[PDB]
């Protein structure tokens, strides 16, 4: 059964190498979440540093692709960094060729096309990663677009990825049923980060210290990650309410 080793069709029209690449996605045992505010897009991800000998500041799955675009990865770090470097290069080339910043959704499509090629061409394996791109696009506003090893991509009101993704997904669904809107009706990004952490706590059922989380925020004209003390400040605000 060599149809399970390379990306050719099985008798039932399936691509097993693509399916197994999806299972590599959860190999890190980390859950991520993305939501949109009025002015911003917030992405949060768990940060697990098991070894005491590790330098915790170098352990990260959130990447600054361009000034405006950020990307969080669910999957092994080697493939994650492979995808990050390519995305950075693609976004840089786009700006040079076409004279404006690459939109979040266009970069998502491009990376999705590259992933599609690995599902069709034999010599290249799929990357075992799911890429969530975030920005505040100058035309479309707050944006979340997500890519997988099948080459599929779509925009999101909000999204979650990881082993316990379904719990977080329904938690968010139920909130948007209640609020009746497509986003978090909040002025400051600080409170949108607070919303993101609050709803992750409820869905996962765990409490977080300042070193258990990793936060990325996209505003107009910049995407940035938060420090441990920025998150601690945010954790204190949730506790005092």
């Amino acid at each position: 059964g060599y149809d399970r080793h390379i990306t050719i069709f099985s008798p039932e029209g399936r691509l097993y190498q693509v399916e197994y690449a999806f299972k590599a996605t959860n190999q890190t045992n980390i859950n991520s979440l993305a939501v949109r505010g009025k002015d911003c897009t917030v992405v949060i991800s768990q940060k697990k540093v098991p070894d005491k000998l590790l330098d915790p500041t170098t352990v990260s799955y959130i990447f600054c692709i361009s000034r405006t675009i950020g990307m969080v990865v669910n999957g092994p770090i080697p493939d994650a960094r492979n995808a990050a470097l390519r995305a950075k290069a693609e976004a840089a080339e786009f700006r040079y060729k076409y004279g404006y910043d690459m939109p979040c959704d266009v970069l998502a499509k491009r990376m999705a096309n590259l992933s599609q090629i690995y599902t069709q061409r034999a010599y290249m394996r799929p990357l075992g990663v799911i890429l969530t791109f975030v920005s505040v696009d100058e035309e479309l506003g707050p944006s979340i677009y997500k890519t997988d090893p099948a080459g599929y991509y779509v925009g999101y009101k909000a999204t979650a990825t990881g082993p316990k993704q379904q719990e977080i997904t329904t938690n968010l669904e139920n909130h948007f049923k209640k609020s009746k809107i497509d986003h978090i009706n909040e002025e400051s990004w600080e409170k949108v980060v607070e919303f993101a952490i609050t709803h992750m706590i409820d869905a996962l059922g765990t409490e977080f210290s300042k070193n258990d989380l990793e936060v990325g925020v996209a505003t107009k004209d910049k995407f940035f990650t938060l420090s441990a003390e920025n998150i601690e400040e945010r954790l204190v605000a949730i506790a005092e309410q």
Binding site: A150, G151, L172
Partner: peptide
């Protein structure tokens, strides 16, 4: 249901007078 299905277009313009739709694998 958290996905925005407007962002995913199954029916696509090829030329001003030609359009396409499909069944099967979306990425392909």
């Amino acid at each position: 249901p958290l996905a925005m299905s407007e962002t995913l277009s199954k029916v696509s313009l090829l030329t001003p007078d030609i359009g396409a739709v499909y069944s099967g694998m979306g990425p392909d």
